[PDB]
Amino acid sequence: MLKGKVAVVTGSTSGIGLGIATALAAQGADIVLNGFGDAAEIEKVRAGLAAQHGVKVLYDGADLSKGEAVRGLVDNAVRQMGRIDILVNNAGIQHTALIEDFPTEKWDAILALNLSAVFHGTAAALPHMKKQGFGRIINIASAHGLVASANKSAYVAAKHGVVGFTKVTALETAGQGITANAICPGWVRTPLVEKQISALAEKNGVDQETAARELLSEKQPSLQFVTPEQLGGTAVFLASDAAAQITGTTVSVDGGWTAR
Amino acid sequence: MLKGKVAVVTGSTSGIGLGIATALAAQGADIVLNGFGDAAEIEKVRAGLAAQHGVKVLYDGADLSKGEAVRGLVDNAVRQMGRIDILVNNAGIQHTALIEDFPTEKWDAILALNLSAVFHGTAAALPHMKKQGFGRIINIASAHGLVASANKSAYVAAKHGVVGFTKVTALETAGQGITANAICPGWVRTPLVEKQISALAEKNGVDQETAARELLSEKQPSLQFVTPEQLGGTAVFLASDAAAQITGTTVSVDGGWTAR
Amino acid sequence: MLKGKVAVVTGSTSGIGLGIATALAAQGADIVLNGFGDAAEIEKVRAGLAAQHGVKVLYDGADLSKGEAVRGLVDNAVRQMGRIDILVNNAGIQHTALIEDFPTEKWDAILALNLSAVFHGTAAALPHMKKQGFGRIINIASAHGLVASANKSAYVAAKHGVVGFTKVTALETAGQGITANAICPGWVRTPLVEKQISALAEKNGVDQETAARELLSEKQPSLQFVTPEQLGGTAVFLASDAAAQITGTTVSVDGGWTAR
Amino acid sequence: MLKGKVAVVTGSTSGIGLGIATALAAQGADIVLNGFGDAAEIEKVRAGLAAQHGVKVLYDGADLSKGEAVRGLVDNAVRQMGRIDILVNNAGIQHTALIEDFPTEKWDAILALNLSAVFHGTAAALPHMKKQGFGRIINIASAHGLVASANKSAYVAAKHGVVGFTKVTALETAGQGITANAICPGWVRTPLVEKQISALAEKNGVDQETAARELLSEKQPSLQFVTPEQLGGTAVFLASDAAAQITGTTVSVDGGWTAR
Ligand SMILES: C[As](C)(=O)[O-]
Ligand SMILES: C[As](C)(=O)[O-]
Ligand SMILES: C[As](C)(=O)[O-]
């Protein structure tokens, strides 16, 4: 369990982020949610999580594209919750295009959220973790933080950056009760992905599930999607005492993506 | 939990292997112990484990250096336990010497036990796991399956082979409800390592714990040993449904060894 | 040889960059130099290289911290030289400090030059290379693009980013006569490093060379520095026809740094 | 150049090994050929090579599956050639089958030749290289020493072991004027692969070259084969002084195989 601990999860108002925040809450950890979205809908999620798991749940709409904002998200978390035991840097954005066609504005935005945001968040939380003698920095990178795909230069670059940053984080905190690791997910069945499937479903005129496997065939050997619940359970493990000596490494949850 | 599941662990009469069998048994899984040791003490361990966790526990002293013996271990486990959901290939041995001074006999022995045993055990288990629709093969490799250390050629080569063998195993079973991963431990405080600490403590004229940190300094940033309880906890995570899509990968538990 | 080909090397007015530019010029390749420095001194280097190797050598002081400037460097190279066969993205900057003490301004500058500069340069050259059916993008990353060191988060993050970006570059150009690889250097004996040695030379009161080995002991097993000439010879190899099917990978020149 | 140097290449009577021995011989190095084949044709190759490059060329048909035979190859090479500056461990064999269907005999044979041979050869060569103050051990591994493919367990495991063994070799020799690296080839158009292309071309009813691209599509992004001339060129680079500080690493020549 994680009773008495505080977890801050960026981009957790939905999808993967929400899956991890939910997994941590179920372990008895207080949660600070974050990300853009509908204020009303967001409150519903927050209150729903708080009630369902009997833990304190807050929401900070801090803009992760801004360094001061990310650092502020962490400070206020400590001010409201009293400490920050776990920091899950999850927020991510993407864009597909050949390198020579890749918009500089897109490249900069992707680096800012997927990479720089991890630095600012980590920089803000480290002092508190070193003081308390306990810390768990869980960066959600990607299979693309280990290998590449054509047309995703900025994302691949940013994610690799995260893995490298995770390693440094671990070395600077080694032995202080703090660990830093990066979960590298393969395909996850997001709403936009679902529309990508339906785009192939009506492209080949096959049922959704067949299209699903079609979409996974190229990169994911298992032909099965990774779920937010599994990624939550992975974050839960890394935050456990059994993962005390697991630091500066990656945990690939990709159905065999990086094995071949 | 793992209630209703059968886990076989090679080299589990003590240390790492024992820690793993215990963590699994603690989750409700029936256990099959194995490994060379003292018959009297082995029975005490076997009986104690069964009584402690209220699960069926057997012991098979099959000689892991013998291919047919490894397969026999698996075969008999199925016959006596009813199935084999989890296979933890843990047994290993080492020898230190320059390549040119490495006895061919030692080279052959390390490869047979540290690598070939994983193949024979995996081969015998796969038909059952594929038929059951469930399987978790967990190979206890080492940080030396990812990086190298001078004077440990046979061990590094064998462990590297284990990581590779693990990846193939995953690809051949992808999607069939079976996963295969390799846990890569760093320094563990075994009884033989303890003697190493004492020897160093004497040579340097410092306390046992100062020597421990000193011994760990070159390879393990944390300056803390990995424990059999931690590795057991890691195996428990990998055998869980949360790790259903974690396959063909490595999970480093090395206090930062491989981060730098 | 590389007669008739054009090479653009960023940050080549001195050190590693100049070593590579010199190595390429010696192969008969026209060169476009770049980087900040003394205008007069720079001209001396340019004219000296041109005369010594009988090839056309130009100098473009374009500021690599600016995206439009990097792209301009490449365009003008093509305008003046007639094409761009080889692009060596070398320019790098660093800063040592704990993550929580790392200045955002420093983090941003490091990412901008060491990572973003590679993207802009590559984006500008790709159209020309795809048109001509020949290309060699040689990114000078670092051992830190593969592993980490404490207190160098931004550099480690940027370099890892470069390796990931190099992989994408390769995949988007695979089979088009273009390859993209990243040379990952270990310790190189730079002027600032020389002062780091002399700082240890007078710190332990030992001769320079002893201090040199002292400085290399922790990360570089060979206890020998990598030279700009060796890095030049490595770039030369990757640009050769024999390296036609070497793409999307790294070439570690680190005296065993990443082997352990 | 490599004039005055002696290079021994296992499995060099044809294909990759031959391409490597030829590139080395082309640089002025004396050569020692080896490998099973037709005596008559082997002599034609041996004699031709010596005449073509004006260097001494011998042939030793030592059975690489025998440990003492491998060491004998090295021993005799020194006695007849005067020394051994370069050792290229190239010989290899394969077999495809599911793990549970993999013959133990095949598993043992692949490990003996693909992995143990590298150990025996390295062990016999090291004493001479350390005494000479010069040495270049080049192990021809494979992309399968870094990643995996289904149904190739023994090959992947053995090649992975070779990469690991290469790293240890480098660390044990670091600084002594000796380097040890592993070249990791992707698809090469061997005579047996040619038959594979024809078979596929027939089954798909397409021309030989269309089938070639089709066969390469799954693993090699470039859709182009790696050549023995390229691998020879790669070996020549690694044996050069420019690669003096390249040690304990892998050089992937796989058309992008390992980038994704
Ligand atoms: C494979 As990706 C999840 O990080 O979109
Ligand atoms: C570093 As170990 C526990 O594999 O000897
Ligand atoms: C090891 As570094 C050269 O890239 O300063």
Ligand SMILES: C[As](C)(=O)[O-]
């Ligand atoms: C992929 As290969 C040339 O090692 O068979």
Ligand SMILES: [Mg+2]
């Ligand atoms: Mg609203």
Ligand SMILES: [Mg+2]
């Ligand atoms: Mg007894």
Ligand SMILES: [Mg+2]
């Ligand atoms: Mg001036």
Ligand SMILES: [Mg+2]
């Ligand atoms: Mg004949």
